[PDB]
Swiss-Prot record, chain A:
Protein name: Large ribosomal subunit protein bL31
Names of the cofactor(s): Zn(2+)
InterPro entries: Ribosomal_bL28/bL31-like_sf, Ribosomal_bL31, Ribosomal_bL31_A, Ribosomal_bL31_sf
A Pfam family this chain is assigned to: Ribosomal_L31
Sites where the protein binds Zn(2+): 16, 18, 36, 39
UniProt keyword terms in alphabetical order: Metal-binding, Ribonucleoprotein, Ribosomal protein, RNA-binding, rRNA-binding, Zinc
A Gene Ontology molecular function term of the record: rRNA binding
Described purpose of this protein according to its UniProt entry: Binds the 23S rRNA. While neither of the L31 paralogs is essential, this protein seems to function as the main L31 protein. Has a lower affinity for 70S ribosomes than the non-zinc-containing paralog L31B (ytiA); is displaced by it to varying extents, even under zinc-replete conditions.
A GO CC term attached to the entry: ribonucleoprotein complex
Keyword rRNA-binding assigned: yes
Species for this entry: Bacillus subtilis (strain 168)
Induction statement: Only accumulates during exponential growth.
GO biological process: translation
PANTHER family membership: 50S RIBOSOMAL PROTEIN L31, CHLOROPLASTIC (PTHR33280), LARGE RIBOSOMAL SUBUNIT PROTEIN BL31C (PTHR33280:SF1)
Curated annotation (Swiss-Prot), chain B:
Assembly notes: Part of the 30S ribosomal subunit.
Covered range of the whole protein: 4 to 81 of 92
Source organism superkingdom: Bacteria
Alphabetical UniProt keywords: Ribonucleoprotein, Ribosomal protein, RNA-binding, rRNA-binding
GN (gene name): rpsS
Coiled-coil residue windows: none
Protein name according to UniProt: Small ribosomal subunit protein uS19
From Swiss-Prot, chain C:
A GO MF term: structural constituent of ribosome
Description of how the protein assembles with itself and partners: Part of the 30S ribosomal subunit. Forms a loose heterodimer with protein S19. Forms two bridges to the 50S subunit in the 70S ribosome.
General function of this protein: Located at the top of the head of the 30S subunit, it contacts several helices of the 16S rRNA. In the 70S ribosome it contacts the 23S rRNA (bridge B1a) and protein L5 of the 50S subunit (bridge B1b), connecting the 2 subunits; these bridges are implicated in subunit movement. Contacts the tRNAs in the A and P-sites.
Keyword RNA-binding assigned: yes
Region feature Disordered, mapped onto this chain: 91-108
InterPro entries the record matches: Rbsml_uS13_C (IPR027437), Ribosomal_uS13 (IPR001892), Ribosomal_uS13-like_H2TH (IPR010979), Ribosomal_uS13_bac-type (IPR019980), Ribosomal_uS13_CS (IPR018269)
GO-annotated biological processes: translation
Alphabetized PANTHER family for the sequence: 30S RIBOSOMAL PROTEIN S13/40S RIBOSOMAL PROTEIN S18 (PTHR10871), SMALL RIBOSOMAL SUBUNIT PROTEIN US13M (PTHR10871:SF1)
Taxonomic superkingdom: Bacteria
GO cellular component, one term: small ribosomal subunit
Name of protein: Small ribosomal subunit protein uS13
Family: Belongs to the universal ribosomal protein uS13 family.
Pfam families: Ribosomal_S13
Curated annotation (Swiss-Prot), chain D:
Recorded name of the encoding gene: rplE
Transmembrane region(s): none
Record-level GO BP terms: translation
Quaternary structure and partners: Part of the 50S ribosomal subunit. Part of the 5S rRNA/L5/L18/L25 subcomplex. Contacts the 5S rRNA and the P site tRNA. Forms a bridge to the 30S subunit in the 70S ribosome. Interacts with VmlR. In stalled ribosomes contacts MutS2.
Protein role: This is one of the proteins that bind and probably mediate the attachment of the 5S RNA into the large ribosomal subunit, where it forms part of the central protuberance. In the 70S ribosome it contacts protein S13 of the 30S subunit (bridge B1b), connecting the 2 subunits; this bridge is implicated in subunit movement. Contacts the P site tRNA; the 5S rRNA and some of its associated proteins might help stabilize positioning of ribosome-bound tRNAs.
UniProt protein name: Large ribosomal subunit protein uL5
Keyword match Ribonucleoprotein: yes
Record's keyword terms, sorted: Ribonucleoprotein, Ribosomal protein, RNA-binding, rRNA-binding, tRNA-binding
Alphabetical list of InterPro entries matching this protein: Ribosomal_uL5, Ribosomal_uL5_bac-type, Ribosomal_uL5_C, Ribosomal_uL5_CS, Ribosomal_uL5_dom_sf, Ribosomal_uL5_N
Any one of the GO CC terms: cytosolic large ribosomal subunit
Pfam families documented for this protein: Ribosomal_L5, Ribosomal_L5_C
Length: 63, 78, 108, 176
RNA sequence: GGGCUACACACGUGCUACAAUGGACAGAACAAAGGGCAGCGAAACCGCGAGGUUAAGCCAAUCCCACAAAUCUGUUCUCAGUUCGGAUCGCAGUCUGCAACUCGACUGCGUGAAGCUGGAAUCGCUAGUAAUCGCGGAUCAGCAUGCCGCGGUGAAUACGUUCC
């Protein structure tokens, strides 16, 4: 590694708003995250909100 | 048309239910454009009068919440 | 930031939430009553509790990409089925039934 | 640190018994990750190269090379030289840290994220992430962002055929 | 049944804005003139709302339409294509009426555009006038930014006839 060229690297304690913590090494010493992988709904299988929401209109006869 | 129901003409309802009591047939020549599409119309090819001709349209699952005269523009343009 | 898109830090909450595609003024006031932020704070000045409640309330609401993709689905629906109202969607002529010898100048 | 241990411990026996190799060395390993930038606005905006010579030093601390055009192009208003695009190559521990940033931290922040494509394999066992917005993992700082200019990531395995690179990158954490 | 509502274009008249003398939210007040019998419709109830159900009173200086609005007073944003503006549009509604698809008005949610005071040219007004704000009525089931009246606040200037 060239000296005086690269920025530093400390042990990043990546957080998440769902409380899940994770560890990398970055420029930032500590990182707070609002949406991680396990918080994002695509990673969590068939998600709650958009997949429960995305039923197309059943020819809305109902009334 | 709010809570009184949807709208159809009685004659077109009569023709379609004669068509639906056995099986589908040829096109229905129908001057009523004002009438909504019930889900019981689907598959019945019907001929809407645009003003000068009878245009045949085949009714699908989507073409329900609209009316018949949405599928026949009356004004030719270019 | 909240729905995958920013809100401005230096506005009040009620109107910083307006810049999210799907929340105007009145859904923002319906949110902040449920959240309890009392409508008089910057969003540069909130707590993680107080903004996390805003986040998951908006996560319950049909906001960010859902709205655009479903409204494109409705427009593509009545374009594809036929449907003179979708013909007006296509050509650049007004949809709701409006005179065209004059202005109609949002659409062409 | 954690993605090497996850890869070795969980993946290498599981992938080795999934593809039934006749030796441990036949198991594909992600060798390098090449991050292309590809900023060609250096012609009309002469300073712009420093954007992502600044940013890609922050994306991974290995400084990218200010890469040059190898041929003069008149249709792009460009002579040979006048350097275009930055380039990071990556192998070691920071790279598994970088996939830890991509998989677990960044790719949620794609503001329209869905299944990123199955059809981004070349036919040899290599993958590319095509990025259009330069702020995905939280270091990028909207404050220091005006031009949204995205990125090309080239995830390069040692896989000889293609669908075993598929079953590698699914197990590393790429969603599809 | 359609069209007179077409639409690449020009072009008269108008409405709304581009904003702090502003926008939003809450409080307080002040009008005139006119309409109502198969019509005006109180109050109560429900609905976020457009409105809805039961129904008092009224052939009317009595009762209703009818809770005037700019205004004034507090709170709030702070000069940006924005807490400006509302076009367009999707969805959900409401009322009228055999029926609102072409082709109705209105509401509710959301999207939010052109526009930051307008080239050549050009119009109106001499006082309760111009500017601005609402109200009313004909027409009419329903449709008003038009028209016809009404009030609310309410100016600037006229040396002069050189010129059109």
């Amino acid at each position: 590694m060239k000296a005086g060229i690269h920025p530093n690297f400390k042990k990043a304690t990546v957080k998440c708003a769902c409380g899940n913590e994770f560890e990398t090494g970055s420029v930032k010493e500590e990182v707070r995250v609002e949406i991680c992988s396990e918080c994002h709904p695509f990673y969590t299988g068939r998600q709650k909100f958009a997949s429960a929401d995305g039923r197309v209109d059943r020819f809305n006869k109902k009334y | 048309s709010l809570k009184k129901g949807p709208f159809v003409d009685g004659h077109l309802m009569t023709k379609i239910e004669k068509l639906n009591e056995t099986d589908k047939k040829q096109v229905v020549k129908t001057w009523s454009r004002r009438s909504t599409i019930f889900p019981q119309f689907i598959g019945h090819t019907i001929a809407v009068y645009d003003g000068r001709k009878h245009v045949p349209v085949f009714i699908s699952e989507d073409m329900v919440g609209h009316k018949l005269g949405e599928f026949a523009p009356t004004r030719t343009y270019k | 930031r909240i729905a995958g898109v920013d809100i401005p830090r230096d506005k009040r909450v009620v109107i910083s939430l307006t810049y999210i595609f799907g929340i105007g003024r009145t859904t923002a006031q319906q949110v902040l009553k449920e959240a309890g932020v009392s409508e008089d704070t910057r969003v540069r000045d909130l707590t993680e509790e107080e903004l996390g409640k805003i986040r998951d309330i908006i996560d319950k609401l049909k906001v960010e990409g859902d709205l655009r993709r479903e409204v494109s689905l409705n427009i593509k629906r009545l374009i594809e089925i036929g449907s003179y109202r979708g013909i007006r969607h296509r050509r650049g002529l007004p949809v709701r039934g409006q005179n065209s010898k004059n202005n109609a100048r949002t659409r062409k | 640190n954690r993605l090497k241990e996850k890869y070795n411990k969980e993946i290498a026996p599981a992938l080795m018994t999934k593809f039934n190799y006749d030796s441990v060395m036949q198991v594909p390993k992600i060798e390098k990750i090449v991050i292309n930038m590809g900023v060609g606005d250096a012609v009309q905006n002469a300073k712009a190269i420093d954007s992502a010579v600044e940013e890609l030093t922050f994306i991974a601390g290995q400084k990218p090379v200010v890469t040059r055009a190898k041929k003069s192009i008149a249709g792009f208003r460009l002579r040979e030289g006048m350097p275009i695009g930055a380039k990071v190559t990556l192998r070691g521990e920071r790279m598994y840290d970088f996939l830890d940033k991509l998989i677990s931290v960044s790719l949620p922040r794609v503001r329209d994220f869905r299944g990123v494509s199955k059809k981004s394999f070349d036919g040899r066992g290599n993958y590319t992430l095509g990025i259009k917005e330069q702020l995905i993992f939280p270091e990028i700082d909207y404050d220091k962002v005006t031009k949204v200019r995205g990125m090309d990531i080239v995830i390069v395995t040692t896989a000889n055929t293609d669908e075993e690179a598929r079953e590698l990158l699914t197990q590393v954490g790429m969603p599809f």
